[PDB]
Design a protein around this ligand. Structure first.
Ligand SMILES: *[C@@H]1O[C@H](CO)[C@@H](O[C@@H]2O[C@H](CO)[C@@H](O[C@@H]3O[C@H](CO[C@H]4O[C@H](CO)[C@@H](O)[C@H](O)[C@@H]4O)[C@@H](O)[C@H](O[C@H]4O[C@H](CO[C@@H]5O[C@H](CO)[C@@H](O)[C@H](O)[C@@H]5O)[C@@H](O)[C@H](O)[C@@H]4O)[C@@H]3O)[C@H](O)[C@H]2NC(C)=O)[C@H](O)[C@H]1NC(C)=O
Ligand SMILES: NCCCC[C@H](N[C@@H](CCc1ccccc1)C(=O)O)C(=O)N[C@H](Cc1c[nH]c2ccccc12)C(=O)O
Ligand SMILES: *[C@@H]1O[C@H](CO)[C@@H](O)[C@H](O)[C@H]1NC(C)=O
Ligand SMILES: *[C@@H]1O[C@H](CO)[C@@H](O)[C@H](O)[C@H]1NC(C)=O
Ligand SMILES: [Zn+2]
Length: 598
């Protein structure tokens, strides 16, 4: 009978979940050791343990066919069994899996080991992305210096890894088809449990796109006044090396030269952080404080004992790209961040601690449910708090922002500053996966792979390389997530839903009322709010036990991903900017880039 089997299945799942958590702990430890300390020995260990876990997953997927799980009464049991059937890369033959693992570590270690020569000292060749190159890209206003570092980095992080990336695409595709997905695109999209997810995002993006075009146009206009028309054209895509970020994904680093009102305050607390003696430890302690103030979970002792919150001073290679780690026991959670004392980094700390909080909130769940409601949910958590810490309201409380008058002009400055991160990012994030999906789906011939990347960056973001590129270059893997095989759509989802979360948290905190001029959404601080924290607890504790619309519903009663909230936040900016662009006869839109030779 199926009655007796469903009882046995429940016992089978309880044991297997515990076994999976314990086996994944071992894998995670090896992966942590490698990311903290890149050596051939640690690479070998990381990959061999992963191969062992993959072999066990195969046996598990095989064992699920012994249970008539699709016939069960319990939605919960069926959801767990379905999670176990999804093998991903572990579906590959033993040898193919080992090759993929070797290919993935080759790309990630290449990225992490990139060193360039000083622009002004051809003998000093130990400059790493974090912190040396990123410091220049964010600070220098010498367009030739910027172009030098752009070219050096993309050549070493991107082009060097073309052949490995090609084999990765091949094996990612083979794995997807062994799971009976059309391609790795569909394998990734499966995480959102919604067959209309792509269309939904297209629809949301199309609504926000006009505002992006206005921001793009205004930024280009302001850059022309700074660099001259020899460097920046009125009608062409913006040369990307001028945007304060290696990938032009966020433009907040050039706010000082593109801010709407330069005679009025622009929030940049990095200087005051240094003046007050801020350390990486203090930054993480302050993040911890924010979470506990909302009646959420305090960081466990293991976190403080085991985390790496400063770049090691020895000679060693490591992955500095900030990350948060769940070890699948109790309270063993960690961050590895090469923390610097800057405003941007203070947000990064809060982002990473958002992941940590999610880990702690769902650690009581069965193993298969110990992940986000969807990948976008995991990315949104910390950003919701960062939206609060970024407000003049909060920064004044912690004494990082002094003598600030919040008039109409200062408000536009702050809204614009926020948009340089939040709106600008949306087409960037969409293109990262639009590009990879098109390769996964076999829609682009190998001979056209590089210009296919730059074509998307042009079409969606209106940016282009500083120098002419061709199919002799391969620039995509110059972005961490592309070398590290990390799905990117999670961030596009996050940047939309984080405003749904923020708006609701602010309403719950009594910090936002659309009919009260004293409580605007863009100055909401949810610090100390138990009510906002309660909504987070309700949602985060669920993990992946229910489809994501149920997790959203637990937060604010809503079930639909919507661009209403983000548009509501930036509405005052939209009104001002549209008028300002008309006032200054600002050209909107761009001609097709000439910077990738087919
Ligand atoms: C991705 O899609 C793939 C299809 O494109 C799919 O591959 C198929 O998986 C099937 C397993 O679900 C498998 O079906 C079996 O076929 C056996 C004979 O296959 C031969 O001929 C094929 C030609 O079509 C060849 O391709 C093969 O190489 C073989 O030479 C059958 O022997 C087998 O049967 C047994 O199992 C069924 C179980 O079904 C249930 O059983 C319960 C009992 O507990 C019943 O209550 C229930 O009603 C139901 O019947 C028994 O019924 C039966 O008595 C036998 O014991 C089975 O039909 C198929 O071969 C395989 N390939 C192809 C090409 O079809 C992958 O599994 C998919 N991958 C993922 C990850 O989902
Ligand atoms: N200087 C900013 C660093 C932000 C670190 C983060 N890192 C990722 C790590 C992803 C990962 C996956 C698998 C194995 C190891 C690591 C994260 O924690 O989400 C990330 O990739 N972040 C951003 C995208 C981003 C979303 N929200 C943010 C809030 C602030 C800043 C950036 C972001 C990026 O594209 O760089
Ligand atoms: C880094 O790893 C090597 C071996 O791969 C090990 O001998 C060494 O102790 C590690 N270094 C540090 C600083 O932990
Ligand atoms: C703190 O959270 C607990 C449960 O996590 C809850 O019972 C308690 O009411 C919360 N405190 C406040 C002040 O709401
Ligand atoms: Zn993240």
């Amino acid at each position: 009978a199926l009655v007796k089997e469903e009882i046995q299945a429940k016992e089978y799942l309880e044991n297997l979940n515990k076994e999976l958590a314990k086996r994944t702990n071992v894998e995670t430890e090896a992966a942590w050791a490698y990311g903290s300390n890149i050596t051939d020995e640690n690479e070998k260990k990381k990959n061999e343990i992963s191969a062992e876990l993959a072999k066990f997953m195969k046996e598990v997927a095989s064992d699920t066919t012994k249970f008539q799980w699709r016939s069960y009464q319990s939605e919960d049991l069926k959801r767990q069994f379905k999670a176990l059937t999804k093998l991903g890369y572990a579906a590959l033959p033993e040898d193919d899996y080992a090759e993929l693992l070797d290919t993935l570590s080759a790309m990630e270690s290449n990225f992490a080991k990139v060193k360039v020569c000083d622009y002004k000292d051809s003998t000093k060749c130990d400059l790493a992305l974090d912190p040396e190159i990123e410091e220049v890209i964010s600070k220098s206003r010498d367009h030739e210096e910027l172009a030098y570092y752009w070219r050096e980095f993309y050549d070493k992080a991107g082009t060097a890894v073309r052949s490995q990336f090609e084999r990765y695409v091949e094996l990612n595709t083979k794995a997807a088809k062994l799971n009976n997905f059309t391609s790795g695109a569909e394998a990734w999209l499966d995480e959102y449990e919604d067959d209309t997810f792509e269309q939904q995002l297209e629809d949301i993006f199309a609504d926000i796109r006009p505002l992006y075009q206005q921001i793009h146009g205004y930024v280009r206009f302001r850059l022309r006044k700074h660099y001259g028309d020899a460097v920046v054209s009125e009608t062409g895509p913006i040369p990307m090396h001028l945007l304060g970020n290696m990938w032009a994904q966020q433009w907040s680093e050039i706010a000082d030269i593109v801010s709407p009102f330069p005679e009025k305050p622009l929030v940049d607390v990095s200087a005051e952080m240094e003046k007050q003696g801020y350390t990486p430890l203090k930054m993480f302690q302050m993040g911890d404080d924010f979470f506990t103030s909302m009646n959420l979970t305090k960081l466990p002792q293991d976190f403080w004992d085991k985390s790496i919150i400063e770049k090691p001073t020895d000679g060693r290679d490591l992955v500095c790209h900030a990350s948060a780690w769940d070890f699948y026991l109790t309270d063993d959670v960690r961050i590895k961040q090469c923390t610097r004392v800057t405003q941007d980094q203070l947000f990064t700390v809060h982002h990473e601690l958002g992941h940590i909080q999610y880990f702690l909130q769902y650690q009581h769940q069965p193993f298969v449910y110990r992940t986000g409601a969807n990948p976008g949910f995991h990315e949104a958590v910390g950003d919701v708090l960062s939206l609060s810490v970024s407000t003049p309201k909060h920064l004044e409380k912690i004494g990082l922002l002094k003598d600030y008058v919040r008039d109409d002009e200062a408000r536009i400055n702050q809204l614009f500053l926020t948009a340089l991160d939040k709106i600008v990012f949306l087409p960037f994030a969409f293109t990262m996966d639009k590009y990879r999906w098109s390769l996964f789906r076999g829609e682009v011939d190998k001979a056209n792979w590089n210009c296919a990347f730059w074509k998307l960056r042009d079409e969606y973001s209106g940016i282009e390389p500083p120098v002419v590129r061709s199919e002799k270059d391969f620039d995509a893997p110059a972005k961490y997530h592309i070398s590290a095989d990390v799905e990117y759509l999670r961030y596009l989802v996050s940047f939309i839903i984080q405003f749904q979360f923020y708006k609701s948290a602010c309403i719950k905190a009594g910090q936002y009322d659309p009919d009260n001029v004293e409580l605007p959404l863009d100055n909401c601080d949810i610090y100390g709010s138990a009510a906002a924290g309660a909504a987070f607890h309700n949602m985060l504790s669920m993990g992946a036990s229910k489809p994501w619309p149920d997790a959203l519903e637990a937060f604010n009663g809503e079930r639909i991903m919507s661009g209403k909230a983000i548009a509501e936040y930036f509405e005052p900016l939209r009104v001002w900017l549209e008028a300002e662009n008309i006032k200054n006869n600002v050209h909107i839109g761009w001609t097709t880039s000439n910077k990738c030779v087919s």
